Amino acid sequence: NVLFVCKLNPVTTDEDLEIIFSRFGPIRSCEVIRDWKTGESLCYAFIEFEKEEDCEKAFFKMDNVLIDDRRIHV
Amino acid sequence: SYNYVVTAQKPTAVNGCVTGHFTSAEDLNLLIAKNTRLEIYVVTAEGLRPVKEVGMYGKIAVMELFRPKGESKDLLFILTAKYNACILEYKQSGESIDIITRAHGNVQDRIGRPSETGIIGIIDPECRMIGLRLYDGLFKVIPLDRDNKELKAFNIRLEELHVIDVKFLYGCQAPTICFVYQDPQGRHVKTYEVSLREKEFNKGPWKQENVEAEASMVIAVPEPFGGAIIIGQESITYHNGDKYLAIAPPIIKQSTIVCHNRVDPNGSRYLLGDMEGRLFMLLLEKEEQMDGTVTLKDLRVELLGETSIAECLTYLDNGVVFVGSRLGDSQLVKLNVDSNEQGSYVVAMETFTNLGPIVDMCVVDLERQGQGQLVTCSGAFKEGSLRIIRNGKLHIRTVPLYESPRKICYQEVSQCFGVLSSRIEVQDTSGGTTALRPSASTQALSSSVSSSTSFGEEVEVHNLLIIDQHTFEVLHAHQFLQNEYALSLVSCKLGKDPNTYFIVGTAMVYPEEAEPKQGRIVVFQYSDGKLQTVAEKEVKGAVYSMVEFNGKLLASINSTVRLYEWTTEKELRTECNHYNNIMALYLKTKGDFILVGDLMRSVLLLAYKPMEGNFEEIARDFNPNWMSAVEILDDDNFLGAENAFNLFVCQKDSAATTDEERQHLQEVGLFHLGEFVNVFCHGSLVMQTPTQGSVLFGTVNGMIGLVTSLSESWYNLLLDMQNRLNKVIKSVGKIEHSFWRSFHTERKTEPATGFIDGDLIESFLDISRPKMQEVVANLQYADDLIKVVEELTRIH
Amino acid sequence: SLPTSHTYLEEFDDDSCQVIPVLPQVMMILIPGQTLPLQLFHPQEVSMVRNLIQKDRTFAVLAYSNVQEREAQFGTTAEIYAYREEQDFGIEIVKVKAIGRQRFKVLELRTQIQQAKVQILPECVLPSTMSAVQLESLNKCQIFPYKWWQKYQKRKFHCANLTSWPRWLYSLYDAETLMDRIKKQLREWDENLLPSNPIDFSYRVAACLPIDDVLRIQLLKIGSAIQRLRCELDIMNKCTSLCCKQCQETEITTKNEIFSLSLCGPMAAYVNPHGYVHETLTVYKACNLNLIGRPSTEHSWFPGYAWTVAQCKICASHIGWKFDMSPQKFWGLTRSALLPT
Ligand SMILES: COc1cscc1-c1cn([C@H]2CCC(=O)NC2=O)nn1
Numbered sequence A: 001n002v003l004f005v006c007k008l009n010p011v012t013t014d015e016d017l018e019i020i021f022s023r024f025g026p027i028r029s030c031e032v033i034r035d036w037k038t039g040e041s042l043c044y045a046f047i048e049f050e051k052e053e054d055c056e057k058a059f060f061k062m063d064n065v066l067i068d069d070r071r072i073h074v
Numbered sequence B: 001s002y003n004y005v006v007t008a009q010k011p012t013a014v015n016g017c018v019t020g021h022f023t024s025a026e027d028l029n030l031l032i033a034k035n036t037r038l039e040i041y042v043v044t045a046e047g048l049r050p051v052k053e054v055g056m057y058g059k060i061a062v063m064e065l066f067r068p069k070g071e072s073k074d075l076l077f078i079l080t081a082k083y084n085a086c087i088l089e090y091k092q093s094g095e096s097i098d099i100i101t102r103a104h105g106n107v108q109d110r111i112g113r114p115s116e117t118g119i120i121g122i123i124d125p126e127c128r129m130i131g132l133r134l135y136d137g138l139f140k141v142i143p144l145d146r147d148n149k150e151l152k153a154f155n156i157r158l159e160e161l162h163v164i165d166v167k168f169l170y171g172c173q174a175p176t177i178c179f180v181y182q183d184p185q186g187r188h189v190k191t192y193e194v195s196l197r198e199k200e201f202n203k204g205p206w207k208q209e210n211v212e213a214e215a216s217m218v219i220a221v222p223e224p225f226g227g228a229i230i231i232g233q234e235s236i237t238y239h240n241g242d243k244y245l246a247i248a249p250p251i252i253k254q255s256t257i258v259c260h261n262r263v264d265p266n267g268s269r270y271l272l273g274d275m276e277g278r279l280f281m282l283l284l285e286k287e288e289q290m291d292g293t294v295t296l297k298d299l300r301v302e303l304l305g306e307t308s309i310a311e312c313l314t315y316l317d318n319g320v321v322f323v324g325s326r327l328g329d330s331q332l333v334k335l336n337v338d339s340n341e342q343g344s345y346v347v348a349m350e351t352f353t354n355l356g357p358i359v360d361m362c363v364v365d366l367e368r369q370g371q372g373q374l375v376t377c378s379g380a381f382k383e384g385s386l387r388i389i390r391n392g393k394l395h396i397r398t399v400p401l402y403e404s405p406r407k408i409c410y411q412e413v414s415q416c417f418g419v420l421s422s423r424i425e426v427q428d429t430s431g432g433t434t435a436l437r438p439s440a441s442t443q444a445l446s447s448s449v450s451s452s453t454s455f456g457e458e459v460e461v462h463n464l465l466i467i468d469q470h471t472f473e474v475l476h477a478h479q480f481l482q483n484e485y486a487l488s489l490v491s492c493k494l495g496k497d498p499n500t501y502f503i504v505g506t507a508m509v510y511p512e513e514a515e516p517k518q519g520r521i522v523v524f525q526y527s528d529g530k531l532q533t534v535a536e537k538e539v540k541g542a543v544y545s546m547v548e549f550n551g552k553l554l555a556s557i558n559s560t561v562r563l564y565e566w567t568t569e570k571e572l573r574t575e576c577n578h579y580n581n582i583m584a585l586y587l588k589t590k591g592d593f594i595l596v597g598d599l600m601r602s603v604l605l606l607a608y609k610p611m612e613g614n615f616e617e618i619a620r621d622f623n624p625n626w627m628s629a630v631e632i633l634d635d636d637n638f639l640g641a642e643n644a645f646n647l648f649v650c651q652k653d654s655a656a657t658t659d660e661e662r663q664h665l666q667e668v669g670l671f672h673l674g675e676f677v678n679v680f681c682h683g684s685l686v687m688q689t690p691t692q693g694s695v696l697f698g699t700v701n702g703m704i705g706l707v708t709s710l711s712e713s714w715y716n717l718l719l720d721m722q723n724r725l726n727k728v729i730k731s732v733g734k735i736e737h738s739f740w741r742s743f744h745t746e747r748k749t750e751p752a753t754g755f756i757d758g759d760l761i762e763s764f765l766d767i768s769r770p771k772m773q774e775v776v777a778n779l780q781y782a783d784d785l786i787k788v789v790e791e792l793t794r795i796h
Numbered sequence C: 001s002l003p004t005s006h007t008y009l010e011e012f013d014d015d016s017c018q019v020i021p022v023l024p025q026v027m028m029i030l031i032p033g034q035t036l037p038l039q040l041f042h043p044q045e046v047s048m049v050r051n052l053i054q055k056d057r058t059f060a061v062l063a064y065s066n067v068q069e070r071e072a073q074f075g076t077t078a079e080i081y082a083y084r085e086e087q088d089f090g091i092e093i094v095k096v097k098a099i100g101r102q103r104f105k106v107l108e109l110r111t112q113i114q115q116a117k118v119q120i121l122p123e124c125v126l127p128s129t130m131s132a133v134q135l136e137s138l139n140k141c142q143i144f145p146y147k148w149w150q151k152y153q154k155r156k157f158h159c160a161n162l163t164s165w166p167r168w169l170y171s172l173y174d175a176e177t178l179m180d181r182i183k184k185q186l187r188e189w190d191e192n193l194l195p196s197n198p199i200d201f202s203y204r205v206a207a208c209l210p211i212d213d214v215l216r217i218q219l220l221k222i223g224s225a226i227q228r229l230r231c232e233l234d235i236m237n238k239c240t241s242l243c244c245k246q247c248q249e250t251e252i253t254t255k256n257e258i259f260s261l262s263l264c265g266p267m268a269a270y271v272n273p274h275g276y277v278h279e280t281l282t283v284y285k286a287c288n289l290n291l292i293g294r295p296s297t298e299h300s301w302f303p304g305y306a307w308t309v310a311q312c313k314i315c316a317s318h319i320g321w322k323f324d325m326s327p328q329k330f331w332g333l334t335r336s337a338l339l340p341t
């Protein structure tokens, strides 16, 4: 029930992404990869939904989703 | 290396002197300590009669006398720099005169940094304790009891940390210690009471008080006056119970007071000596006699005269005063009340020679290639001079300059010495400088001035003097540019120019900077009775030491070491540089090798490669420590003098096959010398064997020394002799030879190696015949050893 | 005086040859007195640290001439004065705050962790340069509360006449004078009005100067304070600009912006929650640095500011970050991309 997305806006924060995906259903957890040696976001995120229903909703209603003025692919 | 060190000319600079009944209960004796030689004279109407001269295996840093109850003559308390404390007695039977150590012992604490204000040693008026301040925040009390044979010391704590001065006070029920100390709030004077029974301190008679901001010395006024006198640079104060008096006479303002003594037993009159020579006379107002208690009423300070710079003063009986000068000739002077010839009551009586402090030394064959005579730049400030030493007992003759000399060199085709000199002028209201004295740099037959901020400040003016070698009259004097400082001087021909030039390196220093950012090198030509300047070239740094090298002129411009060729145009030109990570204070060139050194013991051994034209390093050595002078002995060994008055020999391993061993100097020998060596120079004083080569050295205290090379078999024989003598010779103070000559620094120590103490070996000739038999019993070398020692004695 | 508490993270001989542990992923040239934090995750490090806290809480950090290649000859010890072992998330994590204490030369490095057989280099305190000729009478002038330093030479060095060199030569080898010149040169770049003992002062100043690792290794070699201070004087005159190692053509900052935002000096060491230790230097303003991401108070070292990714303009290397309050804006630069020019 976890979806992986890429090509995210660098300024995006985890809380903002979680709130945005909240329309897709409850989110059990969410994280974004950042270069371990610098702290800069890697534009890759993994959001584990509460159930597979939330993941399906995110996949269905998040295709070509414009968040933070950037398209999100997942 | 296996080298050999002997004392050619003994030290003469006076490091302190005391007056007291030491030889006998009826004879008044003066005891003078130069560095290690204690000289005992009897005060006589006609002057001084030298009775004894005893060497010590240690530098005398504290000298005092004390007369414990039940005795007949005052015992001498000596402390060595290495903290060997001894008590000595004078005993003479018939024609025999011996010194007997009543107690001996080393009193250095295992842990502690020595105080920045140096060793202070003091003795109670009633002779019940001996106090020392060797280590900060501590007070070392030695109970002077008849049962304390070994000088068993005990420490007491001191709350303060910067004790400036400290001395006992007379007329106290229990021993008191009055001391002036520093604090982030100011300077204060405090009294403590030493409870020996409880081994602690107790509340003193009169509590803390503020004193001047430059108080320097405490004087214990004896009974019936009592109390203490604090003599700062601006005001003289006196404290005793509830009586506090003070003055600030206008006379003392020019120069501080750096010595004193007691002229009368009752302490109603005191002497004082400044840095500049003035001899002041502090008089107390004893007239305040009311009810058997005498109290101060005035502190008049009267100027007596101008005497040689006083590192110590003693008042011998009947209006005679010994002025012991450490940086000039010592004097016996007289305080005549009714002479008053020029308003000064001081008329010179006798002059004692103080060869040091040597700052530079040149061996020159003045006669027809006979002996090698010494010309040395001795003294400083007003009492500077040139000294000529001949071997034909040595014979010393003086050429006063009335200014400070720096360096000495000798030109043959001009028969002239070149001497760098400094004099101190005072800034005038006109913006210029006026000379204080008629210095030699101004009284020349011919003079020149080189052509190319407050009021009252002292400005140093630097000159080069050409001095004739027959009469020693200043043939010429040349003044350098304002705020210039001449550092190096060499008399050496260059290249293909037949004539012999003078070369002087100069650095321009300004008080607002640290490292001179500009300097110059000046080539003078001395001919036609005039000092023509032939060339000048400016370098972007300071020029410290210079030498000639294979027909080229080296220089130490800052850290850079540079080579100069002397073209046909009489112009220095640069051939090949070298950049170092140390500043090349010392240069010494032998053959193709250069030895370069700085103050931090950094020793580099550069080499010259004429095939390519550059210098390439060969060997290196870093070991943080203070190095005063460094010399080249042979093609391999290198001798230097370093911190704590030490001599070290660095040898380079030619047999090493690995680079890690080829690029390093294996220290071979160390020797605690007891003398701050300042100049090294090749030469010998004896007509031209067990000895090869010869290196003379001059020190601050005024002794000349000779270091030569012994052969392997000779070295081993002499070392066995050294260890065999150290079991029969009963040195004064029971100070062991191995400890005195043991390399010493504030960090760590080693036993001596690589050197033979020439003094001890030469002492063999003076021992009694029966002693010699025990000295060398199983050697298979008694007369052969006499031959050895006499042959060695024929070197210096 | 907060930045030196690292709140973002449990209280805690000469020439002798000892064998000491080494922490593997650390690469900082620690100089005694500088404080290194660390983060450790692999179990071996955790166990070693626990045993260290038990026994003596010490470990070595090697002054790598090449940290990546682990080829080194000298290093610095460290005493663990604070540590915290949180093993949550099923992985043992130990975050440490230790202080460099002593230095050593490498004899050998036996590989298991590791054990380095090395010898402790002693520290040489050279006594006063005048103490070898000092006149006993004048010693009383050695104590005293442009004019003042002129008086200082005239007083302390009133024995240079007895020797062969002037007083202004012995000012270059006096601890206090050199220390004050270091001060004046420091205040020439900042307005922050640095202990008194020469050894600690020299270590601190040598640490703060924005120089390369080679020169730091050099400065660690020298065991006498005075020579280290002189080498520092030499160094300060030299460095003027800082460039991006990944640029080599674009300067990143000038020494004019250096200002001590932490009591540790303009530059100190920090460790992020993942561990990689960065040497951060604080400057007022940068040049040629673009920002990536937004600010966030997430695990920011300085209490009360935020951080945002900072990288040069041309090669986009991680140069550091840009961080009602005085001062409003400054930049912290990781020394791994600060090449001195
Ligand atoms: C592993 O990389 C990351 C994932 S989430 C945050 C980071 C990170 C943080 N920092 C620095 C930023 C400056 C500061 O004050 N503290 C830090 O720790 N560097 N990288």
Ligand SMILES: [Zn+2]
Pocket (backbone or CB within 6 Å): C244, C245, C246, C247, C248, C312, C313, C314, C315, C316, C317
């Ligand atoms: Zn870059």
